[PDB]
């Protein structure tokens, strides 16, 4: 098992001696490495042309949050409120009150990307699969107050992307 890195030692044979001496005086390995970077000059550059091209991702990838509707057009969220109860950063805050119809609903679902750690526990937790960690990954913004999403904001994110998200979940759920 155990292996000796090094430990191997140079021969004192005169051909070898002259070789190492000529190596020192004439810099063989030096020019070797130099030739190596020469060799990497000729390979095709790895850069992608962002924005105009964008890097590969995955169906499972996590990003901006977004509550989302039934196809019926009704919202999914039902305030079982355990999204609050499982987020380690406890970013989420929820305050449900009854619908006039009598159905359970949120009044001010909110979240703040300032504290959220994008761990995707909320994505797992929801029994009705309401909140979803959306594919979008870019929403850097000027002002701190914008980070602190309101419920309406999440819905708008759910409106913007719904075909996309439904596509990911469609492509992914079997592995769940």
């Amino acid at each position: 098992t155990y292996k000796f890195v090094n430990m191997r030692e140079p021969s004192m044979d005169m051909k070898s001696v002259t070789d190492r001496a000529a190596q020192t005086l004439l810099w063989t390995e030096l020019v070797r490495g130099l030739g190596m970077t020469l060799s990497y000059l000729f390979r095709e550059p790895a850069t992608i042309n962002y924005p105009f091209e964008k890097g590969p991702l995955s169906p499972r990838f996590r990003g901006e949050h977004a509550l989302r509707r039934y196809p019926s057009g009704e919202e999914r969220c039902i305030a079982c409120k355990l999204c609050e109860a499982v987020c380690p950063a406890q970013a989420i805050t929820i305050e449900a009150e009854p619908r006039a119809d009598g159905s359970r609903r949120t009044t001010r679902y909110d979240i703040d990307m300032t504290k959220c750690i994008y761990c995707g526990f909320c994505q797992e937790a929801c029994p009705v699969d309401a909140i979803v960690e959306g594919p979008n990954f870019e929403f850097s913004t000027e002002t701190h107050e914008e980070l602190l999403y309101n419920k309406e904001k999440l819905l708008n994110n759910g409106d913007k992307w719904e075909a996309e998200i439904a596509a990911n979940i469609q492509a992914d759920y079997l592995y769940r």
Binding site: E95, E97, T107, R108, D110, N150, K151
Partner: peptide
């Protein structure tokens, strides 16, 4: 912005005298 309306909704004195 603030969401979920109000809290205590405290009462105020009547316009009518006495």
């Amino acid at each position: 912005y603030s969401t979920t309306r109000k809290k205590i909704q405290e009462w105020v004195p009547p316009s009518t005298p006495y």
